[PDB]
């Protein structure tokens, strides 16, 4: 079973079998007066890792890769950011001080700089406009265009069939929005259809925070963004 929030106390990181070669990893942080789980993924990239998102602060991402050569046992080479908050690239400079080449799009790396967040090295070209698509190893990186933030990018995994949404994409059970302070409530929507329209196959996907499902996860969380914008 997936790993929920109150299972995980803050600081340690589990990892969970979504297929063959792909791992989400979960971790736990406090926001705001409440703690929150959220989500990163783990590819085979032949014999090394390819691993998408911090887990979401140093200490956080210390336990990721102890847990990671603990339980799996190759080397995190690359590390890809989604975007530029700190569940995202928080725990950067670990990863840099670990030996991992961290990565991340232009917009990232500059949004990253301005909020003072940590900034990840290498700079992902192909991604400025949306709808753009890059391989990177075992993975396609996908920017959808603005949403929960305006540089966020989605991951895919041909060979699993296996969709990272990110903090784009809520899960089933997240009726709220929240907080949405650098969003771009009316790009959202028509982001999520560039996903929806680019990985029809898509058999798992995994959002930012919380339990994985399927691409109702897309149409679910246009109905929450949505909602907040009639009220
Ligand atoms: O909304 C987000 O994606 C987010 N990331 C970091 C903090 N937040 C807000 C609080 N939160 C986490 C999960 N659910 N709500
Ligand atoms: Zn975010
Ligand atoms: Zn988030």
Known sequence: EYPTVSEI?????????????????????????????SNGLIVRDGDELLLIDTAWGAKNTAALLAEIEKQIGL???????????????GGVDVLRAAGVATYASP???????????????????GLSSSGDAVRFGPV???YPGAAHSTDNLVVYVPSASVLYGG????????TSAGNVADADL??????????????????????????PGGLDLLKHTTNVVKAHTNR
């Open 9 to 37: 106390p803050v600081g340690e990181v589990r990892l969970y079998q979504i297929a063959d070669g792909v791992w989400s990893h979960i971790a736990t942080q406090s926001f705001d007066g409440a703690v929150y789980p």
């Open 75 to 89: 080397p995190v080479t690359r590390a890809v950011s989604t975007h530029f908050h700190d569940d995202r690239v």
């Open 107 to 125: 917009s990232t790396r500059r949004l990253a700089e301005v909020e003072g967040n940590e900034i990840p090295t290498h700079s992902l070209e």
């Open 167 to 174: 903090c784009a994409i809520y899960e089933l059970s997240r």
């Open 186 to 211: 009316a790009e959202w929507p028509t982001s999520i259809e560039r996903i929806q329209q680019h990985y029809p196959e898509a058999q798992f996907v995994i959002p930012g925070h919380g339990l």
């Open 140 to 142: 396609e990186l996908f």
